[PDB]
Motif scaffolding. Structure first.
Motif: not given
Ligand SMILES: [Ca+2]
Ligand SMILES: [Ca+2]
Lengths: 215, 215
Positions: A127, B195, B190, A120, A131, A123-124, A185, B192-193, A195-197, A199, B120, A192-193, A189-190
């Motif tokens: 990001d 979440y 936005r 994470l 920005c 990832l931060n 970028t 995803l980051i 990691y979201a799943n 975690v 999710l 993040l999706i 995106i890949r």
């Protein structure tokens, strides 16, 4: 809420009452399929995700390595490719496949908390860099983001009149910088999706642990 | 590991030994700052994130509402804007601000697991849609993604010769479809980051719970 087949999956597999693509793997118990807190074990959604999504897991492992360098964990980083054994090329991602195997073998919630926290962190960082890159049409990056930019870059002609090439570079320097951010970028995106799943699976595993260690 | 100021934050605030922008809020204890499992409470990183990032929390709440509709939770959806009280316009996001307040007031890990699972679900739906949209230059969407496309759309001239406008629409129909996906992709990044950070905070909160409920 009565379904004998869900309560008895091995019997369901044996009688062909389901359509599992890899029957019986769902009941295999070991370090590779569980996690533990205080030596209380559960069959892990987190470990199932790693096994079903090896390719995306490797991407996250690569981001773990980036996080180490950004956190100053020198030894962990400089030794990250040790003990590969081969004096010849194997899989292009061999050291990350090796680390993948050791991640699957890790059972302690404590150790797995560390892995995800470093990922994470990377990832931060990425990001935040993107920005900054896009906050003005004229490209200008903070001293810290100039650093991240190059790290992510490395971690991951006018034939009618060649003379005109030289003067086309001034245009192609910005193009190359933007292409790099577009590719970064896309990978973000890949990642993040994934990691979201991953975690969320880990968070659901912890709920199961919370239920189990109660008594 | 000796730092008296970290062990005594209220005393640190009183003597001005730190630079907190909102002193003393970090020691406020209530439903708005804690979560609980089995009536064992912890000061919640999850709740701190919601309070520091209200704007992004509202985005996730909007995605929760989309998830309800995609899951068929009819009543929950059709009643999502009830009990707003005002017969006049207030904040443009008033119903989501109201739900935000009730999310902050929710303490049970069980209830919060449900919130994140629905969010999710919506995030995965949107990612799957974008991938389908971009898998060929010619736009063609599965029957299910055609649906998601319109739902996300709604949930969230040639003055020299006007006649030429009509024939410019055939070009501008594709442009409008792609613009919609670009905007959807921007919001997905936005979301995803946000979440990723929120559910890691939630996962760290569960580790603290695991430690506490041990004894
Ligand atoms: Ca900038
Ligand atoms: Ca398609």
């Amino acid at each position: 809420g009565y379904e004998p087949n869900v309560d008895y999956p091995n019997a369901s597999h044996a009688g062909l009452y389901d359509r599992s693509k890899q029957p019986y793997v769902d009941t295999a118990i070991g370090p590779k399929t569980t996690i533990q807190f205080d030596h209380v074990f559960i069959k892990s959604d987190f470990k199932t995700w790693l096994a079903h999504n090896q390719d995306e897991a490797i991407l996250l492992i690569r981001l773990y390595e980036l996080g180490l360098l950004l956190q100053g964990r020198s030894d962990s980083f400089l030794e990250f490719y040790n003990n590969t054994t081969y004096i010849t090329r194997t899989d292009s991602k061999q050291p990350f496949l090796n680390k993948y195997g050791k991640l699957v073998d890790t059972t302690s919630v404590t150790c797995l908390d560390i892995f995800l926290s470093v990922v994470l962190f990377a990832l931060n960082q990425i990001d935040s860099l993107i920005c900054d890159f896009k906050n003005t049409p004229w490209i200008n990056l903070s001293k810290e983001h100039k650093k991240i930019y190059e790290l992510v870059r490395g971690i991951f002609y006018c034939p009618f009149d060649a003379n005109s090439t030289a003067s086309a570079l001034n245009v192609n320097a910005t193009l190359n910088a933007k292409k790099t951010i577009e590719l970064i970028t896309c990978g973000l995106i890949r990642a993040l999706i994934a990691y979201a799943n991953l975690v969320t699976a880990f968070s659901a595993d912890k709920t199961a642990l919370l239920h189990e260690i109660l008594l």
